[PDB]
Structures are given as C-alpha cells and as structure tokens.
Design a protein around this ligand. Sequence first.
Ligand SMILES: N#C[C@@]1(c2ccc3c(N)ncnn23)O[C@H](CO)[C@@H](O)[C@H]1O
Lengths: 533, 533, 533
Amino acid sequence: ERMCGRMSDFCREHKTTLRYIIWGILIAGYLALVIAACVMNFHRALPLFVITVVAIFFVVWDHLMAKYESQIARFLSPGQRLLDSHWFWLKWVIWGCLILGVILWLVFDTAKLGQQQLVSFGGLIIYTSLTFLFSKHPTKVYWRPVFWGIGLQFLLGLLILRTEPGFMAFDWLGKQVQTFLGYSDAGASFVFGEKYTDHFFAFKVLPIVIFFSTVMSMLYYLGLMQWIIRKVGWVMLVTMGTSPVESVVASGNIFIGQTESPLLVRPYLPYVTKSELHAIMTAGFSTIAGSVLGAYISFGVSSSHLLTASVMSAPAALAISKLFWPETETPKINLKNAMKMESGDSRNLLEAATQGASSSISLVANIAVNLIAFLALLSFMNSALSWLGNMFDYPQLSFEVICSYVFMPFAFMMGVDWQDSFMVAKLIGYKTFFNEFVAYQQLSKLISLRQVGGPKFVDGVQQYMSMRSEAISTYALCGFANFGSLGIVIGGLTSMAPSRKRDITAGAMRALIAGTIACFLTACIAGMLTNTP
Amino acid sequence: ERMCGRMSDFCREHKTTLRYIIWGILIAGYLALVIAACVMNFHRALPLFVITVVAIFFVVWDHLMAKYESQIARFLSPGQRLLDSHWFWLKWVIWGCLILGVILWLVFDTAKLGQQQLVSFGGLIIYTSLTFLFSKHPTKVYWRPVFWGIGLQFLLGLLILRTEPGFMAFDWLGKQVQTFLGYSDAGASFVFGEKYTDHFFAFKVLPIVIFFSTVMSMLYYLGLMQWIIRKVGWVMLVTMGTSPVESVVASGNIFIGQTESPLLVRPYLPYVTKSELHAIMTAGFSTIAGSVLGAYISFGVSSSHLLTASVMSAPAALAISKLFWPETETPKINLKNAMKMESGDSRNLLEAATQGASSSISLVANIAVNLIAFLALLSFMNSALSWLGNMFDYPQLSFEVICSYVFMPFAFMMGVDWQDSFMVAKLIGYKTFFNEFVAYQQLSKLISLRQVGGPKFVDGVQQYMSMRSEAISTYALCGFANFGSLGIVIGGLTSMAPSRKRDITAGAMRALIAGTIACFLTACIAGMLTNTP
Amino acid sequence: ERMCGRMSDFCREHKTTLRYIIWGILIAGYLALVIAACVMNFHRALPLFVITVVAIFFVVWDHLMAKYESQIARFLSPGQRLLDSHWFWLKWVIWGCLILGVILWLVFDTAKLGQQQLVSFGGLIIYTSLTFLFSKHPTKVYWRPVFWGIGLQFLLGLLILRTEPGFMAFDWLGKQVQTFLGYSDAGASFVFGEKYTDHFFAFKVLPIVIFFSTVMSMLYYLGLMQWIIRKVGWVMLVTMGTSPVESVVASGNIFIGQTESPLLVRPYLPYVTKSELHAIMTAGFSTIAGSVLGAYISFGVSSSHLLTASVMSAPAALAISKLFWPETETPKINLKNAMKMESGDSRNLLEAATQGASSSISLVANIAVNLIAFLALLSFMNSALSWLGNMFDYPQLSFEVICSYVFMPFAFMMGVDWQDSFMVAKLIGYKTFFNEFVAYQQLSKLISLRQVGGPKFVDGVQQYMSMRSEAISTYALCGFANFGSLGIVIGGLTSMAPSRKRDITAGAMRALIAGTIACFLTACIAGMLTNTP
Ligand SMILES: N#C[C@@]1(c2ccc3c(N)ncnn23)O[C@H](CO)[C@@H](O)[C@H]1O
C-alpha cells in the first residue's frame, strides 16, 4: 500500500492549505453565482446581493475587531482619559440636556397625541417608583443600569414605532415569519392527512412549534444564534454596565426559552451572585421563546408587535432586576468566560435537526395538557361562581367579572382608556393565573371581532376594543410569567446548579414580579408612543 | 431607609397577630356573605349553609380532639377496665347475639328475596373458606380483622343499598361526578376543535382523566384527601385492629392508584413486615383510582355502584390480606408515623394543578397503547381459534366461549342466575386477562343493549342480562388486578424500597389473588343485598 | 395443619415427576386434538399437521445435537483431517470449479436476460473494489468472509427469486404478514373511533407498529427469536468464519432494530475489538426492524422483496464490514458466551405484551415528529431553491432535481436503466438525507402511479418506472442508514458500554458507509437476478 502511504503523507503535510483551498473554491463559486445572477438581471437579484454584501461586511468587521483590538483600544484610550478628566463638570451638562430633551419631547408630542400617552408616562414613573420602594436593598441601588435600560427601550420604541425605516423593516420581518410558519403544513398534511384542519390547534399549530424548535436547533448548531446573542449582550453590557453573565442571559432569552437560556452559562452558574441569579430568573420570566412565536402569530396576534416586545423586554428585564435586587457582592465571572457558549453535541446539521425535533415532544405535550386542565378549571370555576352568585340575585358573577375590577388599575396606568381597561384586565388575569396561551387566545378573539366590523356594543356589553389597546395588551402579555411556572423554573435551575438550591428559591417570586413589571413597562412605552386612531 | 427598617421591625414583632387578624377578617367576610345569602333567600341558599355548618362542626371537633385527647382518654379508661373485667363472660353473649341477628336477617330477608341471595351468602362463605384453606400460615390466623371487615362491609351495604337516606346520598354523590366530568369538554373542544367527538375515546374520555388527575393533585395539595384518609383509616384501625401503615394505605387506595398509594408511607416502607407488604399490595390490587372513575362513568357504568364498591373494597382487602397472609412478626411503625403524610413540593395551588396535569401524560399514553395492543391480540386470538375450531366443524370457538365456561362457577357463587353467569364469566375473563377497561366497555355495551329494549334473545343468543347481574358485575370488576400489572407493581414498590426486593416479589401473586377474592366478596355482598326485579 | 404439611412434603419429594407428568398430559391432549382433526378431515387439517411435524422434528433434532455433540464431532473428525491433508492441492480445483460455474452462469443466463444484469454484476464488482481500495487496513484483509458472504447472498437470491419452491414460500410468507397487520384495526377503531381512517397515517399505521412491537416482545419472551437467531448465526459463523459476537448481532439485526440488537450481547460489549464494534454498527445500519415492516407494507411496498432484502442484508453487512475494517486483534469472547442471550425481566406472557406496548410510545412519537420536521424542511428547501433558481430563468431547481444527477451513477451501477436511474437517484437522496420512511412513501407513490395504468410521460415528465427498477429500489432502500441516526446510535452504544466511547465514535461513519454499500450490493444482486418484463 505504498500509494496509500504516500497519499496519507501528502494529506498530513499540507492539511491546512488543502481545506483552505477547498473553502476558497466554494466561496469563489458562490460569488460567481451571485455575480452571474446580478448580470442577468439586477432588480430580480437585489436581495441576494444585499445579503452577500452584509455577510461580507460582518465577516470583515469581525476579523478586524479580532485582529486589531489592542490597537483600537490604545487609540481610544486618550479620549477616555480626557472625558474622565472633564466628567466632574460635564455630567451636569449632559444630564440637563437629556432632561430638557425629555421635557421637550413630552410637551411637543405626548400632549399633542392625547391624555392617554401622558397617563402611560405617569404609569411608567409609578411602576419605577413602586419597584424602588419595595426593593431588596433600597440604599444599594446603582442607578446607571435603570436609566440606561429605560433609555434603550425608549430609543427602540422611537426607532421601530416612529420612523418609516424601522417600521418597514419590522413589518417585513414579521411578514417573513408568517411565510415561514406555513411550511409545517407539508408535514402536518402527511402525518394527519388532508383532514388535519378538522382539529386546528392540535394538528396544525403544534407542528409549527415542532418546526420552529427544529429550526432553532439547526441555527444553534450553525452558531448564528450565539453571534447575535454576543452582539446584543455586548451592546447591553457596554451601555448599562451589567455583568457579562446576566447580560448574556438576557440577550439569549430574547430567542431561547426560560428553561434553556441558562444553559448558555451552565458551567459558571454555581459562582454567580444572588443579584445575577435574580436577573437570570427575571429575564427568563420577561420574554417568550422563538419556538412558541408561530403559535401566537397563528391566533392572529401582530407579529411585528411580538418581535418588538421581545426585543424591548431584555433591557427592561435587566433594569427592573437591578432596581428590585441591586448588587451587593463582587462578580467573579469575566467577559471571556461569559461569552463562550458551549455548543451542543451534534455531529452534523441533520443530527441537530433531529435532536431539535425530538425535544419538542415534551413541550408540545405539556402545551396541550396544561391548556386542557386550565380550561376545565376555568369552566368549573365559572359554574361555581354562577352558582354562588345566584344566591344574591347576581348569577353573572364570574372569573372575568372579578378580574375586570381587580386588575383594572394596572391596565389604566399603562395608558388604556377607561372603557378598554376593564377588558384588558381580563387578559391580565388570564395571563397571571393560567398562562399566556389562554390570554392570547382571548386577545385573538377580540382582534377578530374588531376586524369583522360588527356592532361594538350588544345589549350594553362591549364586544371589542380599540387597536391601540390591542397593541398595549400584546406588549403586556409577551412573557412566560405565571403563578404556575415557578416550580419548573426552580427545579431546572437547581438541577443545573444543585449547590445553589437555597438561593434559587429565595428570589423566584421577586423575579416573577420583576418580569411582570418589566412587561408592564414595555407596554407603558408602547402606549406612550402609539397614537389614538 | 428608616421607614423600611421600622416597617420590618413592626412585622417581626407581631407576625403572629397580623396573619391571624387577616385570616379572621377573611373568615368574617365569608360568614357575612353566607348570612346575607341566607337572609335574601333561605331555600335558595340552603346548600351553602349546610356546607358551612358541617365545615365549622368538623373544625371544632378536630380542635377539641387535638386539645382534650388526654382528658377524654382518662374519662374513657374506667369503662374499658370494667368491660375487660366482664369480657370473659360477656363475649359469649355478644357473639351469640350477633349470630342470632345474622340468622334472623337471613331467614326474614334473604329467603324472602329468593334463592340467588342465599347463593350469594353461600358463595361468601365458600370464598372465605377457600381463602383460609390456602393460607400462608393457617395456624397463625387472627380472626378479629376478618370478621370485623366482613361486618363493616355488611353494614356499609345495608346503609347504602337498603335505606333511603344512604341511597339518596350516594345517588346524589354519583350525580355530582357526572356533572363534574363534563367540564373537561371546555378544554377538549379547544385543543381538538369542535370535531373532537369524531374520535370519542381519545379526544373526550382521556381529557376527563387529565382533569381528574389535576383535581386530585390540587386536593392533595389542599390536604383534604389526607384528612379523609386519616378519618377512614382510624375507623378501620380501631375496629379491625390492623397496623397503622396497612390501614392508612388501604384507606388511601380508595382514592389513589396502586402505584401512588404507597407514597403515603414511603419513608417507613423498608421497616414494614411481610404481612404489611402483602396487605399493601392486596389493597392496591383491590381498588381503582379516582383519575379513571370518569372514564368508567362515561362508558355508562353506574357511578353510585362504582363509589360503593370503591368504599367497600378497603375492609374486604384488609380482611382477605389478613386471612391469606396473617401476621407472624412484630410491627415497628406506630400510629403517629403512619398518619403523617409528607405532602408534595408544590408552592401554590396552580403549581399543584400543573404538576397533576403533567403527570397524566404517561397515564393516558399507556392506557391508549395497552388498549390498542390488547384489542389487537384479542382479534388475532379469536381468528386463530376460529381457524382451529373449523377443523372440528365448530368455527364458533372463541375466547369468549371458553371464558363463558371457565369462569362460570365463580359468577354462580356470586349469586348470578344460571343464564347470566355465563355472560358474567366473559367479563371476568376480560378483566383477568387484559384489564378492567375492556370488561367495563363490554359491560357498557350490555347495559346499553338492555336499555334499548330490543329482543333479549336473537337466534338463540342472549343479548343482555338483568340489572342485578349488571350490578354484581360492576362490583366484581372494580379493581386493577390483572396479570399484566404485576411487573409494574413490583418495579414501583422495589423502586420505593430497593432493600425489600426479595420480599416484594414473593407475595405479589398472593396479593393479586387476594385482591380478586376481595372484589368477589364485595360482589357477593352486593348480590345478597339486591333484589330481583 | 398436618394435611398441609403432608401435601408440602409430597410436592417437595417428587417435584420433577409431577410437572413432567403435567406437561406430558398437555402434549398428549394437543396430539389428540391434532389426530382427531386429521381423522375428521385431512385436507382441511393439513397445515396444523405440517406445523406439528416440523415442531417435533426440530425438537428431536435439538435434543439429539445437544446430547450427542461429542460423538458427532469425533465421527466427523477423520474426514476433516483427510480434507486438511489434501487441501493444499484440492483448493485450486475447488476454486477453478467455482470460477467456471460463475462464468457459465454469467454467459448462459445474464447475457440472455440483457445488458442491465451484466451492468449489475459490474456494479457489484466495482462496489467491492471501491470498498477494498478505501479500506482501513488494505493489507490485513481476510478474504474468506467477503467471498462467502457474496456467495451466500447469491445462493439466497437464486433460491428465492429463481425457483418455484422458494418463490411460493416467500410470497406466502409476505401474504401472511399482510393478514397479520390488519388485526391492529380492532384497537385503532375503538381508541380513535370509526373515523380513524380520516387520519390514515397517525391513526392506522402507527398502531400497526405498536402491535408488531408487542408481538415481537411476546416472541422474545417465548424464546423463539433467540432460537432462530442462533440458527442463522451458527450458519453464518460456520460458513464465513466470523466472530461469534458479530455473527449473533448480524443475525439478530434481521428482526431487531439497530438500537436494541446489541442488547443481545450487552455484558460482553466492553471486551469486543474495534473490528467487531464496526461490524455491529454496520449490521445495525444495514437492516430494518420488524416493528416498522408493517408500515412499509401498508404504504404499498412488496412484502416479499422486503423480507428477502432483510434476510440478504446480514451476510452483506458482515462481508462489507470485514473488507472495510478487517480484524487485526485477537477476539476474546467465545461461542458459548455469545449464544446465550439474557432474556428480559417478564414474569408472564401478558406482562411481556404490556412491556412491548409501553416501549412503542417513544418509537411512534419520534417517527411522527421526525417526519413532520423533515417534510417541513423539504418544503422550505424546495421553495428556497425555486427562489434562487428563478434568478437564472430556471425556477424548476429543486432538491429532487439535484439528487437526480448527484446519485444517478450509484443507481446506474445497480443495473437500473438510463431513464429510471434518475428517478431512483431521487429515492436514494431521500433515504440518505432524511430517512427511509420518506423514500418508501415516494416509492409507494410511484408504484401506485404505475399500477393505475395512466400515461407514462406527461408533458415530457416521466410518471413511473418499470417494476424491476421498483424492486431494485426496494432492495436499495432497506436500511436505517442515514446521517441523522449517527448521534442516537453513538449515544445508545456508549450508554451500553461507557468505557468504549472513544472507539465507538471513530468507526461510526465508516459503519454507516458500509451499511449503505451492503444495501447497494443486495440491490445489485437483486437486479442481476431479475428479468426485464
Ligand atoms: N412547558 C411550557 C411552556 C413553554 C412554551 C415554550 C417553552 C420553551 N421553548 N421551553 C420551555 N417551556 N416552554 O408553555 C407555557 C405556555 O406557552 C409556558 O408557560 C411554558 O411553560
């Protein structure tokens, strides 16, 4: 086998150049395809050219930052020194300018829009005051992260809701997801036949969850998700000054679920402080996964609003966590350790797809079993309350009626008008007690009722609410927080970090309340930026 | 934060009085609601008043027993001493009176009712004799528990089947469960659509199991189930003189499945004796779980009879366990240890509901798969026996035909008339060989056929049986005793108590036979108390 | 209890004779039934008589071989010595005779049949040459197993495809399975109602898998499967000279899935060599399981061809494993250790049935979820490729179009004609990239399209292929070899043998390629033996 030996020696001698040449040939072929498509027709091939240009730009940027980090840091250093030297007097000027800008924006936009947006701003202030008053360590509050998170939320709201470029970009991004969720019909029709639409939810919606889980697993294998998570987490860390671990987990929670987000920093969980653990739990409670976004879109909820709320939740979660439970210890983990995210054990893309598919079985089973149990309990409770109510000549007593009054003040502070606050209170109660699926189902019912165009009041009962109220409800309901998800979170986090069982249990309720408050703050900003039609 | 410190000091100083005052205010509000409902209309608010009165009575009784236990015991002591002093001669008088009462009841009721009830009594005697003859230690039999269990069964049968108060109470209780099982339709319609009735069993019956599991978990969290179990177990322990652990497990098995009832005494399992272990297994085999009651009621089986058999099974299970495998060791566990039941790790009611919901997944999956496999095996066996039978010009040979003859003597001793004994034998075989679900499905088929009113014989084949025979079959079929559950029972019990693997395996078959015999004894009593229409 | 003591003493004294007498009485009863059936009518009772005769013959044969092994070996020894003495010169005569026979068969059959069978033979030669060239140790090849496996495949093909007895036997065997898979409808109708056919795959096909899993578990409990596996494994071991462990695992893989076949030799896995491990993995990848045979038959794939491919795969798998990764170590395990197969922990037949039923839950769930995910990914990829293709005025670009050209050379070497090679390439790609379920679904689509009789070309697109091409595709697609199962295979094998994790990972890809090559070799033989209609 002399030929085999010679071939092996050749491969060993120049292994690096051979694979590099192969990759270069593949890249050249792709570029040739792109240029040929552009030559044949440019308007038709524009999106491919844009994607290629942005990919090349990001690759070059990443390479340059990796290679010239020290030089750039040294070049930036003198400016930082001068700014530190002049900061003692420049801070007052900067703060005064920011306050003046806030006042001018309020006076010239919010007052023009109407009273409800001013009420939204007041509700944001009140939620922040309430969070501060019931803080774990009111005297140890570091105010930089809170104001920076609120400012980042406000900037995102202005960019996405008050500008044509951002509005078009997010409308397009939402429209793409609707196209993407339709592909699961191919599998659903085969597995469940052409009559799979006879049982809409079980045989059409859950397959969307399965497909999205599979796609998320494939993306995680490809490493794009860690790239985006690192970008957003670095932005938050440099702006808000938060710890690398909590910043990374908050950025990840935008896409990944509550129970699978901490796995990004699993090795370092035992050494985190109490504040970081509370922030991790708050971020988990304040966002929704990407697996269960197609399910919400299928009901009829706006995709653009869901994406915007998911993006805005992370800074809100971090700010509310820092205000509610400020840091009183020294963080141990560093940026390099936090940013490295151990990828899963998948040998190839198809194995990653199969692993993502397999994991969805438990998720889709629980999603249906919990819904069955909660809807049965709701029907039983409504019947029991009607039975009790009839003894006072009030057989209309129900869970919805009680929620309409208990949670109305929370909806009013978010900027919902008086009439629609009682309807939003019912959704708030549904989310708080059972889960977000039950609340989004009712929200989709109301959206469809409005879109039909029928009478708004029948026998004195309001049938649907305004579109701004619907948007505010969508922002408020975008989370994983409910009184029934505390046990699974505690169990999973203890399983990842058994030594920290005592600490995990202590802050879980505060993290859940912080998540709800962060969702309400995002809803407050959305309400204060939207206009009354 | 001086105000925060002062508030914390105030809370710490008088924590006990603050929560007590809050609870008192809640109780006062509830009482105000009840009295207002009664004032506005009394006949309409009667059940609420009754529930409040019984709850207050039980709370006061429990408090008094807890506080004045020593005083009551001391007050009772002299009477016990006098009774012990005179017992050597009073025992013959008491036993003679009981025997005379039994004879008088037989002569003046059973003979009047007909021959079949005398046959039921003879079958009860024969089953007890057979249990004694094949006993593990025939010379070590303690006869108090056997006679006390039989007497308690007879008293329960007289109270429930032969008196208007008990009959009305149990009919009402059964009717309430039928209303309760309808609530799962709310979840079933949403998850599976409005066409969920196109697949009746999978999309309507199993959700009832899920909802019942959720409700049972919520009740166990609330602690009412332990209260009722403790009451019934104390009654049995004081009457039959059984060990606290076995009494508690028998009482619990009325509501809880065989595989979860032992969890009530999990810490003390390693120290139980062989007789207690056999009694635990017999009780598990002799009763059903509350989660599957809804499916049986949905098939069409009488709810009142199911509840009565479930209640009567526990004393029968304990008596048959004690007779078949009497105690030859010294029990180690005491009443206080047996009665304390470590509750689950649920932080709030909604978490308990979600945990109950999640557990039901495997239950329903196993039920569906087992039914599919058993029905396919039944069809294959029937086809194979028809193929074999045709070689003797008897192509009618089938599993049902063989069962009609093999198990007919067991049905006849239970008091079923000659014609219907062969039909009950088929149900007995179905239960013995596959499970109680198929036997109850066939029983529901027969009940529906009778209720239609069609011809009783078509081409010489009997289509349905009498209602007394149906009741006797319902009593006989109430149990999880089948050859296929021996493996799972042994696995679960060994998992709870690994050290006792050798002992668990030894008595499992005897416990299964004891459970079947206990079910047959309950059927015998039901038959001897029912009348021929 | 003197009577009980005497009975126990009697039972202990003559335990062996009592059970032997009972078994003899049962056997006498069975023989009486058989003889009576034969007397009443012989033609009607013929199959029962045949089954009884074959069972008696096999029992007597097994007893004689067990009892007289040493005597038979000694009697055979002198002939072996003479053959060894004369082998140095007789080997050339034997090899020349075999080569002449091969040449004569080629010239007088293959040339007559047509060019395509000669191309199949050339493809077999090319596949063997390619396997040799890329071998792990090309200089350590032991050529006995390769030639013996190829000869055994050729003999099986001649017996089953070129003789009336074998053809009738295998057609009958396939027809029996079609009858057997119909029994699951009894359970499916009850669990899913009479409308279970509204969702054909989920509510009719998976229950077949459940029933087949249950039947396989019952057979494994009964010990017939080990009997057959031992017979086939001894045949392969004596002919090919393979190690006992690899022979036993290859024989078992004919009926058992890749993930459960190694459990037959679980205790001895840690001491196997690298070559044996590679052979185990190749055998697992080169065959299908009996649980999924029913689904494939339900789709419309020929049952006889599936059975023949499953039988032929084992020698092909072993030969390709030995050629690709030859043995360079000393095997430690012996025949006696390999042949003993520790049975499962099932106390009775019904418990075995329930355990087989329970295991099927994850199998069917994973099948359904993987199918949904793969079909959704296929639809998304087809849409993306159409979007990319339209930029070159070729919107017809698709995954199928690319596969039709990428894998066409593999199909052509198997003997498929030029036109149908492109269609077989699509099925090859489907199997390689997602699984064998989708490829078989497409094959059933094509088979139905051919069986309808419509036009073969519509607008220049071929609709269906010849029946010989369908048979070759059926042979080629019989295997669990796909990129997505590498992870689960490695995980399961490491779980069984944690110490061998490093060795398991190294050879998994080579074992998958060897399995694919073995499937292609079986397809090559099937093509070279079939005729063009
Ligand atoms: N279980 C679950 C959940 C869910 C949805 C999506 C996920 C996910 N990606 N990872 C873990 N959980 N998860 O369903 C409820 C309603 O949507 C929620 O409260 C979650 O508890």
